Amino acid sequence: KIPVALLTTTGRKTGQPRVNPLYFLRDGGRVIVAASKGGAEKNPMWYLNLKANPKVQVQIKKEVLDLTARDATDEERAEYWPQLVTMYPSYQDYQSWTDRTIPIVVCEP
Ligand SMILES: C[C@H](OP(=O)(O)OC[C@@H](O)[C@@H](O)[C@@H](O)Cn1c2nc(=O)[nH]c(=O)c-2cc2ccc(O)cc21)C(=O)N[C@@H](CCC(=O)N[C@@H](CCC(=O)O)C(=O)O)C(=O)O
């Protein structure tokens, strides 16, 4: 239905690789994900991990991409958020129900 990307982050405490499935957009070499965690009030751990260890790896089907993750800028959110919402409308609910602003993470070559 919606394909997932596998995001590997380095544990910001343990240093161990952690892998999580996420929905994604691809734009010009970038992989974009949202740290929505089903509308939970706290950011997911993988987001905390990539804040401490920006080098991540993303696997989409066969491709294994070595990327550097960062938060979307305001202008990027305005471009990507509607695309994410179009793809998976629940994102908009999750954003409504959560106090924190749901991070949009841009992973770049
Ligand atoms: C529960 C925790 O996961 P998390 O990193 O908080 O991520 C929560 C969710 O985002 C994650 O489960 C997503 O995969 C859920 N999820 C999506 N989550 C999203 O946020 N966005 C999505 O688009 C998304 C899509 C999706 C599709 C299918 C599916 O099955 C799940 C999907 C986890 O895996 N904990 C591990 C590892 C935790 C970890 O990374 N530890 C760090 C320390 C972290 C710290 O305490 O600071 C370390 O090793 O050093 C553990 O405790 O054993």
Numbering used by the authors: 43 to 151
What does the paper say about this structure?
A deazaflavin-dependent nitroreductase (Ddn) from Mycobacterium tuberculosis catalyzes the reduction of nitroimidazoles such as PA-824, resulting in intracellular release of lethal reactive nitrogen species. The split barrel-like fold is characterized by a central six-stranded antiparallel β barrel in a Greek key topology with four α helices: A at the N terminus (the putative helix removed for Ddn structure determination), B after an extended loop between strands β3 and β4, and C and D between strands β5 and β6. The identification of these residues and the lack of classic catalytic residues in the active site suggest that Ddn functions primarily by precisely orienting PA-824 for efficient direct hydride transfer from F420 and potentially through additional transition-state stabilization.
Cocrystals of the NΔ40 construct with oxidized F420 were also obtained in two space groups and were solved by molecular replacement (Holo-1 in C2 at 2.1 Å resolution and Holo-2 in P21 at 1.8 Å resolution, with an rmsd for one chain of 0.3 Å over 109 aligned Cα atoms). Although the F420 preparation included larger polyglutamate tail species, only two glutamates could be visualized (F420-2), consistent with the structure of FGD1 crystallized with a similar preparation (Bashiri et al., 2008) and the recent observation that F420-2 and F420-5 bind with similar affinity to Ddn (Gurumurthy et al., 2012). The crystal packing combined with crystallographic symmetry operations reveals the same decameric ring structure in both structures, with five monomers in the ASU of Holo-1 and ten in Holo-2 (two rings per ASU). Although the decamer structure includes extensive intersubunit packing, its relevance to the native quaternary structure and function remains unknown because of the difficulties of studying the full-length enzyme. In structures Holo-1 and Holo-2, F420 binds to a groove on the surface of Ddn through a series of hydrogen bonds and several salt bridges between positive charges on Ddn and the negatively charged phosphate and tail of the coenzyme. The last visible glutamate of the F420 tail lies near the β1-β2 hairpin within hydrogen-bonding range of the side chains of R54, T56, and R60 as well as the main chain of K55 and T56. The more proximal glutamate H bonds with the side chain of N91 from helix B. The phosphate of F420 sits near the complementary positive charge of K79 and H bonds to the amides of M87 and W88 from the loop after strand β3. The deazaflavin ring system is stabilized by H bonds with the main chain of A76 and K79 and the side chain of Y133 (helix D). Additionally, there are waters in both costructures that mediate interactions between protein and coenzyme.
